[model samples]
Target: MENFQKVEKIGEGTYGVVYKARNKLTGEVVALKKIRSTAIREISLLKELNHPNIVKLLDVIHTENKLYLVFEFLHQDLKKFMDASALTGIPLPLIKSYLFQLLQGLAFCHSHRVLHRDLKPQNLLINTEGAIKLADFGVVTLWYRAPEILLGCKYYSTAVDIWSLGCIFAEMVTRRALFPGDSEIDQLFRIFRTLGTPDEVVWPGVTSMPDYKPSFPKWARQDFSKVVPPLDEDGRSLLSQMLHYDPNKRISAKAALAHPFFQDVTKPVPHLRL
Candidate 1:
């Protein structure tokens, strides 16, 4: 639409480019994404969501060869924030607050039958007042993807999001990717090396998964404390539950808010207006 003017290129996706723009009539700034007639599901599903911890979809428009999705402008993504603090990691209280807000967003989505499917530092937007909102959808990113998805599971549960949250939580603690794999096969092996190879005992349907292989090498589970040295016992405990091999038994996003790790975390009001 002619109502908005592109200011700067903010991001690039496989479909098209995203820009920081201003609404000419209202003088309101926004993040505008241009797609080439794909991901109608993201548009519909995002329109159905309205939460403080989820990105707000302000408007949508379509043309013969291009589609536009307009969203509230956010200051930065979690990846940039993490990178800036790589040497020291994020402060513990902010980490707790960020994780709590993330869980709240995910809880809202799962309750409404929406799955982010893709959850990573880049997909999570943040403002200066310490608010984190989940963004983007369709297909799980390999680094944050759950073991079940990597194994070719056709049916998905909300647990897949939880797995990605666990990875994000760990990254916030260590300021690096927890499971950085180059390929799908390498991804599974990386997960196996850290959490140990899954079996029927841990994940009941592991053997029957379409991509399961009997010859996969086995490894023993490592200590969570050692993996995420900055986190306390409570945080590590919650991480273990979120990353549990059994999707059925993984901690629900709603339940995670009540975990002891966040018991002392004071929620801070976010300043999202520009």
Candidate 2:
């Protein structure tokens, strides 16, 4: 604790409050997260995980009662960046770049069978150079949660995170939440309103989910272009695949990278994407 100086409160997670810190000996800016837990595996997992788009965990400081995980600091998150941008919508090129990096990192996570479980604008870190990395895990929240999770479907796979990626991609284009709901039912309906009410036909066995309700207002399938207005043809196509109600049918991170939206773009970590 004495080796690093806490700069400011970054944000609190399921574990503890994260703070921006400066390593006194190394003279490097870092995010110091202190977690109080007895049984945790992700800390050690971060050490073995390596990817350019993923935030680097520099080291871990373990004490008698707490664990301090240090990570390389970044400029800002996508949420703050879009909120601060002068334009109502983000530029198409930057949106393409951000999504490219996001999926590249996500693909790596999925390859390792590490489900982020939480992928939102706040969880996506961005540098001034426009590099973005995925963050957070297992903290259930609104806005970016996938349809299956909201429907109380357990035993999800990497497909759940891919759905969150769709929500995030749409936000980068529209600068607004695609499904900004205050309650669980509201969230499901918001998705239904845009994607249309799902039955056994679209989402086979959806009726058997414990949390599913038949009370949703029926909505015809709306055009993806209308939901995220600023998207191009390929962008809309990719988003539709990502947001599919059936988890098994969702677009994979690797597949998303190959989508035509990123066809012309050369990513820094194309290897990770493939």
**Best prediction by lDDT:** 1
Q: So what's the TM-score on candidate 2?
A: 0.91
lDDT (Cα, tens digit) per residue for candidate 1, span 152-234: 99998989999999999999988889999889999999999999999999999899999999999989988897799868899
| Prediction 2 global C-alpha lDDT | 0.82
Candidates in order have lDDT scores of 0.88, 0.82
Best model per TM-score: 1
Residue-by-residue lDDT tens digits, candidate 2, 98-143:
8888888889989998888888888788775658887654434688
Candidate 2's displacement at residue 128, Å, is 2.2
Model 1: how far residue 211 lies from native, Å = 0.6
What's the CA RMSD of model 2 in angstroms?
Answer: 4.2
Q: Using alpha carbons, what is the TM-score of model 1?
A: 0.94
What value of lDDT does candidate 1 attain over all alpha carbons? 0.88
Q: Per-residue error at 131 for model 2, in Å?
A: 1.0
Poorest stretch of ten by lDDT in candidate 1: 265-274
User: Cα lDDT for residue 262, model 2?
Assistant: 92
lDDT of 2 at 53: 86
